[PDB]
């Protein structure tokens, strides 16, 4: 006998083992990330105070298409980078969640990296 | 005397002046020691480093604060308002 489960708790555990040496100073805030199944959501957060700094999403209607599963997040990285052009347009603290530098992640990552911001 | 037989359990170490060195409240240096230990009885927190021998040193100068860490564990903080 054996059972199937949710992966998000493992994501979160790995995320916690990451967060140890990794926190939003409110100078290089932590860029927290989440893909559930369909849309990928993101938030620049201060952790010195624990308070947000932005709010962005794939299913956020501003950057919204039916492109790739991937270029969607890339668009979001451009859009949130413009949002950061307001402030926090600098090199900051990136969080790979309990995820990897690959796929949707890497796409959106370089999107935000090359849409102005130099973490 | 006459035949005094021998033994062996007469061997031990030279102790190591372990434990703490400073207390909750007092003010410190940058290269200052606060605790000689083994393992991690207490974990360094703020402005503290764990050297080779699990020796804890406050990074900076300031006051000390021992405190709990989790539900059941301990840590150390150092604050430099001073």
């Amino acid at each position: 006998m054996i059972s199937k489960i949710d992966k998000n708790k493992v994501r979160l555990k790995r995320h916690a083992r990451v967060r140890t040496n990794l926190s939003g100073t409110a100078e290089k805030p932590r860029l927290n990330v989440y893909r559930s199944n369909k849309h990928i959501y993101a938030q620049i957060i201060d952790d010195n105070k624990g308070v947000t700094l932005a709010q962005a999403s794939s299913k956020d209607s501003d950057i919204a298409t039916t492109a790739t599963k991937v270029e969607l997040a890339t668009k979001v990285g451009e859009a949130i980078a413009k949002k950061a052009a307001d402030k926090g347009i600098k090199e900051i603290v990136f969080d790979r969640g309990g995820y990897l530098y690959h796929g949707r992640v890497k796409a959106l990552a370089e999107a935000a990296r090359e849409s102005g911001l130099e973490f | 005397k006459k035949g005094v037989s021998s033994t062996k359990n007469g061997r031990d170490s030279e102790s190591k002046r372990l434990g703490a060195k400073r207390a909750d409240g007092q003010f410190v240096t940058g290269g200052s020691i606060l605790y000689r230990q083994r393992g991690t009885k207490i974990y360094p927190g703020e402005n503290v480093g764990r050297g080779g021998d699990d020796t804890l040193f406050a990074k900076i100068d300031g006051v000390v604060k021992f405190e709990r860490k989790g539900r059941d564990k301990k840590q150390v903080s150092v604050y430099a308002v001073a």
Partner: protein
């Protein structure tokens, strides 16, 4: 019976003589029993003689429970030899008690019979004692 027959170390420390009974001060297995009024050691042997006496007086009568085991050794050198060039071998095993600490219990036999047997056991014993019933109320 239900024991790890081994030990950790041989030469251990001579325990605390003073104090009080941490427990074992009540009747559980038998109905009648004996508790104590002193706080001294036992040498694995007054028990032997005592249960022998109680048995052979009971004529293989009632049932009996010892609440004891010498968990602990002592040592002794040979006769009055010079001092401090080691620690002597063991000579026996002991288990100190406390006043109030039960020692023996019995059932399946008369009150007075038990009383007599226990009295008789005490006489090969080094400690003042007391005969007791199953506590109630």
């Amino acid at each position: 019976m239900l024991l790890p027959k081994r030990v950790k170390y041989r030469r251990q420390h001579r325990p605390k003589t003073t104090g009080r009974s941490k427990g074992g001060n009540y009747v559980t297995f038998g109905e009648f029993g004996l508790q104590a009024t002193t706080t001294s050691w036992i040498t694995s042997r007054q028990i032997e003689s005592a249960r022998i006496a109680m048995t052979r007086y009971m004529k293989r009568g009632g049932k009996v429970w010892i609440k004891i085991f010498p968990h602990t050794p002592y040592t002794k050198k040979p006769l009055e030899v010079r001092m401090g060039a080691g620690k002597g071998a063991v000579e026996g095993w002991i288990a100190v008690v406390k006043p109030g600490r039960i020692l023996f219990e019995v059932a399946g036999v008369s009150e007075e019979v038990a009383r007599e047997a226990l009295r008789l056991a005490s006489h090969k014993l080094p400690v003042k004692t007391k005969f007791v019933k199953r506590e109630e109320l």
